[PDB]
């Protein structure tokens, strides 16, 4: 009488802000 | 009379950080107070969370986020300033 039926998929992909590393020496 | 050693950021920000620090560097005489003044001022304008070091002898490994990093001298006094978190 009955069987499976369709997914309902919705997704909001992350993002994760950017970041750089840095190195610095005085004199 | 200020040399920019490495910068990520940002004409206006950059030149704002520069011209600030100079204020700092004439009101306050103690190195840790110069940092205080800059760190505080930036949280006000450009939003937490900023960090400042101000020194003659030091090196640094640091992690910042984009267009929010600056490292320059005022004569001998070097300023490290960046945002992170």
């Amino acid at each position: 009488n009955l069987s499976v039926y369709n997914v309902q998929a919705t997704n909001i992909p992350p993002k994760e802000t950017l970041v750089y590393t840095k190195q610095t020496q005085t004199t | 009379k200020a040399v920019i050693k490495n910068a990520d950021m940002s004409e206006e920000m950059q030149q704002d950080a520069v011209d600030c620090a100079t204020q700092a560097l004439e009101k306050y005489n103690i190195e840790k107070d110069i940092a205080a003044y800059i760190k505080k001022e930036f949280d006000k304008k450009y939003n937490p969370t900023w960090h400042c070091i101000v020194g003659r002898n030091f090196g640094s490994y640091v992690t910042h986020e984009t267009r929010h990093f600056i490292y320059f001298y005022l004569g001998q006094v070097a300023i490290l300033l960046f945002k992170s978190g």
Binding site: A9, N11, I12 | -
Partner: protein, 104 residues
């Protein structure tokens, strides 16, 4: 009767825009919002007086840069039964509401 998919999504919309239309995210409030949203449709598709059973869910997620992922299959009779999902952003939170329409 049966399950008009528009006569739910138009009915959801009102709910969403009623409860969380015109305010940003705030913890002390959210859960009472979802509480309403859902206990609001139900109050509307039961007045409706159809020979149906229903299930009604609400998500609300803050916009902070976390990554959310939906998935939803079921096991009904495709001809008698149906379901409506609805998605609603502002600035400070996304939101997803999904009502299902199983027959007796």
């Amino acid at each position: 009767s049966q399950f008009i998919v528009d006569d739910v999504s138009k009915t959801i919309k009102e709910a969403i825009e009623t409860t969380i239309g015109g305010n940003a995210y705030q913890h002390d409030k959210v859960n009472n919002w979802t509480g309403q949203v859902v206990e609001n449709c139900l109050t509307v598709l039961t007045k409706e007086q159809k020979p149906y059973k229903y299930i009604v869910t609400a998500m609300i997620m803050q916009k902070n840069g976390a990554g959310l992922h939906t998935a939803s299959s079921c096991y009904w009779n495709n001809d008698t039964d149906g379901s409506c999902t609805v998605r609603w952003e502002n600035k400070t939170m996304y939101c997803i509401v999904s009502v299902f329409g199983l027959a007796v």
